[PDB]
């Protein structure tokens, strides 16, 4: 869980970030609230334009799924009723997969969730709470649950998991499970053991994120 992030790296965007876990590096940018296109307009709430760009080649249907899952996480996080008939552009440029993209998209999704959240924080957009996402995997010979697995570990995995939780009260109370994307062969006992260990490492991540956010933003503010 030795992640590293930077905040406010882009000039022509309201907010930006660069999240790095292992070899997975994703840069994200957020502009909003701004004027929306007519087809995007929502009478009462904020409209989200979510874009995911791959590390190699052009955006395909694969990234279209990454956009969809990332939408399921960011939508309830943002206090959308504060910005009626308005738009918020959220762009993720995956710079380095950190995994075999022909087989997995686990680490890229988690890194996009964490980066998007950080970019939303930087942009100063109304959020109902905080959030953290981690990738998890299981190995058949080992029987182990490995949090933040490497690319080599994924190759020999039986199941891959993306867990993103919603935290409140100083990152101590799990408000809800924003996203759990479990793929592969697994049983009910493995699922809850995954959720128990997953919640712990997620809570540790929020604490680390809270540290990063305060370290970067506080110099900008005044005492």
């Amino acid at each position: 869980m030795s992640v590293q992030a930077e905040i406010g790296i882009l000039d022509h965007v309201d907010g930006s970030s660069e999240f790095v876990s292992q070899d997975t590096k994703v840069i994200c940018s957020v502009t909003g609230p701004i004027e929306p296109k007519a087809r995007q307009e929502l009478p009462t709430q904020l409209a989200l334009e979510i874009i995911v760009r791959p590390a190699k080649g052009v955006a395909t249907t694969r990234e279209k799924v990454l956009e969809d899952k990332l939408r399921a996480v960011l939508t309830p996080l943002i206090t959308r009723h504060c910005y009626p008939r308005q738009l918020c552009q959220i762009t993720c440029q995956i710079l380095e997969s950190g995994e075999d993209e022909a087989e997995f998209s686990l680490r890229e999704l988690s890194c996009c969730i964490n980066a998007a959240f950080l970019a939303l924080v930087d942009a100063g957009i109304a959020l109902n709470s905080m959030c953290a996402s981690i990738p998890i995997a299981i190995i058949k010979d080992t029987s182990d649950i490995i949090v933040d697995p490497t690319a080599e570990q994924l190759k020999i995995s039986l199941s891959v998991h993306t867990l993103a939780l919603e935290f409140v009260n100083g990152g101590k109370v799990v408000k809800n499970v924003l996203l759990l994307d479990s793929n592969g062969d697994f049983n009910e006992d493995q699922l809850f053991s995954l959720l128990e260990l997953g919640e712990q490492k997620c809570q540790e991540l929020v604490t680390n994120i809270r540290r990063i956010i305060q370290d970067n933003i506080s110099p900008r503010l005044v005492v």
């Binding site: 070899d23 701004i34 334009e49 190699k56 052009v58 955006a59 440029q93 710079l95």
Partner: protein, 299 residues
């Protein structure tokens, strides 16, 4: 989505040019300091010019050559813009005026010019070959996208290394990097782009029928200077003292001798830039070798 520019800002930036002043404090003939950072993987390069940030990634995969060219490999360059560089850019807008121009400048500078040895991308004639792909990612826009991309693509191609392949009959044997070292690409020449921006300090009448020329030309304009220019010129050269391509697609009519002056001024810049790229590649190679020695020693 438009960028609103007040009359005051338009008059100020133009008047500053009339007083030999540009906002960033540079010189009319001064090119921005280019910073080149290589990632862990080969083909991963990050180019930075002031606030302008671009990232290029070189990749390749086994593919079959076209019927017309059985001895040549495949090579494509992608430069899709995104709202990350600014909300002025539409996501996936690959038919806009500026987009198509930029796409065509890079293509004529690298692809068409034959900067990459596509003949050396062939494994077995008319059957299997390498398909090199250059993906440019525009992170942050402060002008000079064309110059930043051309450096990003070239630095990437010269830094990239493809895995060794042995072929017997139909079968293809893709050797992993650890078992045997990867092989660099073949570069015939190193094309570098330098973009000039033109400003008419007077009116159109004095540009068309005016006796003495007074049009201002600056090298490597920022976003603000780029939005207020009347004409653009992109000239590509290499250390061999040859013009790879020149593109002044319309805009402010400019004196021929002035355009020639720009080409000679750009040549001094591309020389410094090319040598700079080579040096950063050597040090990167020395860095990777020194770590390889420190990894084998302790091992």
């Amino acid at each position: 989505k438009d960028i609103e520019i007040s009359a005051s800002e338009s008059k100020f930036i133009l008047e500053a040019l009339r007083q030999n002043y540009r906002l960033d404090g540079r010189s009319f003939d001064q090119f921005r300091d280019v910073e080149i950072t290589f990632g862990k993987e080969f083909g991963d390069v990050s180019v930075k010019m002031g606030n302008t940030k671009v990232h290029c990634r070189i990749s390749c995969q086994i593919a079959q050559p076209y019927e017309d060219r059985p001895f040549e490999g495949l090579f494509v360059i992608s430069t899709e813009i995104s709202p990350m560089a600014g909300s002025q850019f539409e996501n996936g807008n690959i038919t806009g005026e500026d987009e198509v121009l930029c796409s065509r400048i890079i293509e004529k500078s690298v692809r068409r010019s034959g900067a990459l040895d596509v003949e050396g991308l062939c494994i077995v004639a008319g059957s299997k070959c390498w398909a090199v792909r250059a993906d440019v990612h525009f992170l942050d826009c402060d002008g000079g996208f064309i110059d930043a991309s051309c450096i990003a693509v070239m630095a990437g191609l010269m830094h990239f290394k493809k895995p060794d392949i042995t072929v017997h009959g139909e079968q293809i044997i893709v050797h992993p990097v650890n078992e045997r070292e990867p092989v660099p690409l073949g570069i015939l020449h190193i094309p570098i782009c330098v973009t000039f921006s033109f400003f008419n300090p007077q009116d159109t009448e004095e540009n068309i029928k005016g006796e003495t020329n007074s049009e201002i030309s600056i090298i490597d304009a920022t976003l603000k200077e780029e939005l207020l220019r009347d004409g653009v010129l992109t000239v590509t050269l290499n250390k061999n003292r040859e013009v790879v391509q020149v593109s002044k697609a319309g805009g402010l009519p400019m004196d021929a001798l002035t355009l020639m002056k720009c080409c000679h001024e750009a040549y001094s810049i591309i020389e410094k830039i090319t040598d700079q790229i080579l040096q950063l590649l050597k040090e990167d190679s020395e860095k990777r070798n020194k770590y390889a020695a420190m990894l084998t020693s302790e091992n």
